[PDB]
Amino acid sequence: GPVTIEIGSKGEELAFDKTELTVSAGQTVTIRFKNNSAVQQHNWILVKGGEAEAANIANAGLSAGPAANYLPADKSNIIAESPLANGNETVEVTFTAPAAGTYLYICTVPGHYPLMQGKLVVN
């Protein structure tokens, strides 16, 4: 059944406060991402592919800029995107969990990846 998963920045660090999440395939998941920094922007992006695909997406975001959520307009390897969260802001994204497997979630704000990453486990 539908669930919310709470996640945030690890305070002022370039890290999520949870490095792994477990859901069921097909489950309705609302990610409620709380920016616990007053001075960073962050997002939570669930991607398809390995760390190489993550790095590619983040790298594209450098020249995409904030109005495009530091993301490419090509969504072939993006499963879900949080809105961009400014200082002290909470944002949400609701998505249907993908097929069973493990997926990376990353932040594409310039410079935060590769440190700012975690893993979604779908059973």
Bind-site residues for Cu cation:
42, 107, 112, 116
Residue 99 CB, nearest distance to Cu ion (Å)? Answer: 27
Please state, in angstroms and rounded to a whole number, the distance separating the CA atoms of residues 40 and 29. 25
Binding mask 44-83 toward Cu ion (x if CB under 5 A, else -) reads ----------------------------------------
Segment contacting Cu ion (CB under 5 A): 22-30, 52-60, 63-71, 99-107? 99-107
109 touching Cu ion, by CB under 5 A: yes
Distance CA 25, CA 37 (A): 32
Residue 41 in contact with residue 109, Cβ under 8 Å?
yes
Backbone angles phi, psi at 5, to 5 degrees: -115, 125
